[PDB]
Design a protein around this ligand. Structure first.
Ligand SMILES: O=C(Nc1ccccc1)N1CCCC1
Length: 182
């Protein structure tokens, strides 16, 4: 409906796939080459389904900060025959607060779904499902089961992936440029 949704749609159409693990279906953001991200609670194994195709996982890393605290981001390299468009120049370099963000989801359950979530706080520490987690962004939207992996964007920036909620607020793990230096 506006430039926020326009940027969000451009990322969804070219840089997302539907990832299925034994823990469910997730929006998965492709970042560059065959490298993608997914919330760590997806429990990626040796084989993942990508758009319902059986796919070998060439490598997977659950990120933690230098305090050895969970960040809830898993970086996955996929044995896929096609590269993602490189979107690393849209990733923020530093932890920050944001105005006017969109959370975008694409699964069997929620196809072509775009939620304007408004202001995004750099929340920092969150006990997420019992697990101490750092670099959490928070938005005041009642997000629901099925939105995990959803992409958070502002005009011009891809800032996080949805990892939880408490019924009133939603929480995303930051994406930072430094995660994807090759
Ligand atoms: O599931 C939803 N809405 C919704 C709300 C918040 C997050 C995700 C989805 N709907 C079912 C029919 C009316 C709308």
């Amino acid at each position: 409906m506006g430039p926020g949704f326009d940027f969000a749609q451009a990322i969804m159409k070219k840089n997302t796939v539907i990832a299925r693990t034994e823990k469910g279906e997730f929006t998965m953001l492709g970042v560059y080459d065959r490298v993608a991200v997914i919330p760590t609670h997806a429990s990626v194994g040796e084989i993942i389904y990508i758009n319902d195709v059986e796919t070998r996982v060439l490598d997977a890393c659950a990120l933690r900060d230098l305090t050895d605290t969970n960040l809830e981001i898993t970086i996955v390299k996929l044995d896929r025959n096609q590269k993602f468009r490189d979107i690393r120049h849209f990733l923020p370099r530093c932890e920050d607060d944001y105005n006017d963000a969109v959370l975008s989801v694409h699964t069997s359950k929620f196809p072509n779904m775009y939620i304007p979530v408004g202001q995004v706080t750099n929340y920092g520490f969150l006990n997420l499902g019992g697990t101490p987690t750092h670099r959490i962004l928070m938005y005041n939207f009642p997000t629901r089961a099925g939105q995990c992996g959803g992409v958070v964007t502002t005009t011009g920036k891809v800032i996080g992936i949805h990892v939880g909620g408490n019924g009133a607020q939603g929480f995303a793990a930051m994406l930072l440029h430094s995660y994807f230096t090759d």
